[PDB]
Amino acid sequence: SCIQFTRHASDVLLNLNRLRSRDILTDVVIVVSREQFRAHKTVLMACSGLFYSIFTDQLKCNLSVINLDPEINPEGFCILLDFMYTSRLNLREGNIMAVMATAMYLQMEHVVDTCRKFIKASE
Amino acid sequence: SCIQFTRHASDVLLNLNRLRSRDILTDVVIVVSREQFRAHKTVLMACSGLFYSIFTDQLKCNLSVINLDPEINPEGFCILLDFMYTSRLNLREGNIMAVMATAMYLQMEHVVDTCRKFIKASE
């Protein structure tokens, strides 16, 4: 018999992105080649099958630094990290291949889906 | 020129509630009289003006235990904590006064609003 506040989940995510921008309570740095991205492990796990697996691991759960595969593109990761915290995906002709490859590695199925559909439309 | 995934914020919140249920990466215990509630500081701050103030404080940000005012009702807190993690508010005739008082203390304006409207309708 609960009532539900429609905008609550979006409002929570907006405040989680504000915390990220101010570097408040971030507990991990994701290293992608020469670039570093600070984030909250809980948000990363909530968005990505890869991070969910990593941070449920009894040893990796305590690491402050995670190094991604050297094939991962930093811009592609940046775009996906922004998506995690905002629901908005900056998908462009010039970045779609990197975004899709990064989303496959991060196991972000909905992003992979749409990248596949946008690529199919251009061929 | 971003695209947006409509269900993303709800999906994130669902996974944050799964983390809470499994006690994964919880970093604080909220003590309400004889009861204890484990949570994630980032979610508490994202939902509550009181916790936002507490956890941005340069000393309180590092506490693992927060004790609420002894006038706070544990069930009212439980209902609001569930709301934080689900967008669903279990508002009942028998708990509305406790929920509204707890929401005022926690500075959860939308919950206070609706409690006020539900009370006004019954008088």
Binding site: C2, I3, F5, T6 | -
Partner: peptide, 4 residues
Amino acid sequence: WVIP
């Protein structure tokens, strides 16, 4: 607020 809505009835979900």
